[PDB]
């Protein structure tokens, strides 16, 4: 009575695709296991223009980090959806991909099957793109039909209020005279460029388009498919028997009246609970660096040291202007390449970071107390370089809406900094929290990028036509950071002021276990029969953009992986 073919751990973003998928089979028997709840009538969530609201509320994990030592000390909140959709409910809503060198990346790691190529068939799977009203293309809106899906769960489109405006009229042209082309999709694997970007967006109902209404909700008659809901998995529990390789027999789970149990996977178990959890999960488990797990009274089961190691996320700052008059229009997304930000400056940067990538290697081994070698994070490290230098990949996105009245807005992050940092559980009681650790500022190049990144949109806000329409800017100022300031200020400003931009990867990475990966090209976890892990975890290095489109991307395809792994075994 408690057992099912597959256990998928997590309701989120990914976890909700897997589930969608493998219940396709009538008869396979799906099981979800989510510890938050259906989300279909919040308000904060439903709200195509309610990103920010939930912050704080019952359905946002509000995840803490340690102090940030590279960054003042700080600690940062890192926030993520409590919630049937995961953090997809509580996100923004730009749908935006990634670079197409940068997934072929990963097949060069050692990752077979994972190209551009290869994903693109499943970005598409995914994606039901609607397409633009007349004022909508008026204002800049536009995709190639090539590289977008119309039959897949996930609808896409441009907000109900998306209009022309002086604002985006204004960002278009300016951002050309810097020499960033203006393109129709940054989703067909090149997204340099300034663009009208498309939504997480069911443009029928005008509702935010999250994992749940997209995958779970319009299959929820499916008697295969079953969801427990406020329900926490604790840690998986395993076969007995001399199998040296570790069989996952189910999941242990705390329901919300209290109760205590067990259910039981006859084929697999899927971990899909999310990058700040997945690898806390596996530890639980078992799975993990045995001195952790010792230190927490766990008994190893698969000696995997680097679970919850090479995390890697990015910090967002934001930048202010006042109009003459109000400011209106599309909200606008540009992906500028290194050169595009640093111009004549650029030669400089590229020779300084080719000269620390070595120093950052040397740096990054303590991190993981010794379990990744320089050797190896000198050739990962070389490969983002690449990258950023000889393929020219966005290294900042910058987005720019209307701010209210005269006000406009700016947020941007450094898309792919250096620093890594790990999270691991404090304790054997899966209701602690974790130790946290994104390492933020780590590395020079962390900083320095977004400086420049900073430096740029003050020169953007002070350029024609843009300059025309914006009398000044107010944030950070030129009170606060004088037009003679040097980069240090810069940085300084961007330490005091960043927030954690909720895009972490990597803590149960995709590549070689000899290089300390934790899932093969499968997305099984190394040591075990029948346990995947399909969700941010996996990621092995940053993409450039907005992280749902390619988990989706991912998650189908990892279902087809599963599903063809079924039919032989
Ligand atoms: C505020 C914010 C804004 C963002 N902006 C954007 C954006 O505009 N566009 C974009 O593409 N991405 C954005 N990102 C990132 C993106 O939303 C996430 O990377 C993505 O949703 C993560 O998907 P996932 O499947 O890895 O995990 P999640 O979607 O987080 O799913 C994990 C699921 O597991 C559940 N869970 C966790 N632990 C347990 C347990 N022990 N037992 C049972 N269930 C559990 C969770 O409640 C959750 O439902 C944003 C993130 C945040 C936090
Ligand atoms: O993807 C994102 O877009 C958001 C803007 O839409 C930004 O605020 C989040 O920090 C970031 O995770
Ligand atoms: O997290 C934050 O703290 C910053 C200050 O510490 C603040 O300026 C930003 O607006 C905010 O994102």
Known sequence: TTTYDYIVVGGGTSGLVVANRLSENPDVSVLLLEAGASVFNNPDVTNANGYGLAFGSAIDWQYQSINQSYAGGKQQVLRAGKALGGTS???????????????DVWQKLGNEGWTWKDLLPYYLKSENLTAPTSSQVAAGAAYNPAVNGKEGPLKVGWSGSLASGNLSVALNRTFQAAGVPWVEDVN????????????????????????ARAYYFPYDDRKNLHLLENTTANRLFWKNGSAEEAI????????????????????????????????????????????????????????????????????????????????????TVT????????????????????????????????????????????????????????????????????????????????????????????????????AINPNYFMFEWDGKSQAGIAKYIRKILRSAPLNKLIAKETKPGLSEIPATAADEKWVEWLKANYRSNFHPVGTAAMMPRSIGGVVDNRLRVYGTSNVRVVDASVLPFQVCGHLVSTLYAVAERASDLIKEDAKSA
């Open 89 to 103: 409910t509580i996100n923004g809503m730009a749908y935006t991909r990634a670079e197409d060198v940068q997934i």
């Open 335 to 434: 992906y500028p390449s290194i050169s595009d930000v640093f111009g004549n400056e650029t030669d400089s940067i590229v020779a300084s970071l080719r000269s620390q990538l070595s120093d950052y290697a040397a740096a990054t081994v303590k991190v993981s107390n010794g379990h990744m070698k320089q050797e190896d994070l000198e050739r990962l490290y070389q490969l983002q370089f690449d990258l950023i230098v000889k393929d020219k990949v966005p290294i900042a996105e910058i987005l720019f809406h209307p701010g209210g009245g005269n006000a406009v807005s700016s947020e941007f992050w450094g898309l792919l900094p250096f620093a890594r940092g790990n999270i691991h559980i404090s304790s054997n009681d899966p209701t602690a929290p974790a």
């Open 188 to 211: 067909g694997g090149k997204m340099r460029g300034f663009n009208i970007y498309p939504s997480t967006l069911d443009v029928d109902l005008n509702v935010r388009e999250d994992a």
């Open 248 to 331: 996952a027999d189910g999941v242990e789970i705390t329901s919300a009246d209290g109760k205590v149990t067990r259910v039981h996977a006859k084929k697999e178990v899927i971990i899909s609970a999310g990058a700040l959890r997945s690898p806390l999960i596996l530890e639980l488990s078992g799975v993990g660096n045995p001195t952790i797990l010792k230190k927490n009274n766990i008994t190893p089961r698969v000696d995997l040291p680097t679970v919850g190691e090479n995390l890697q996320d990015q910090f967002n700052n934001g930048m202010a202007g006042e109009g003459y008059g109000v400011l209106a229009g599309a909200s």
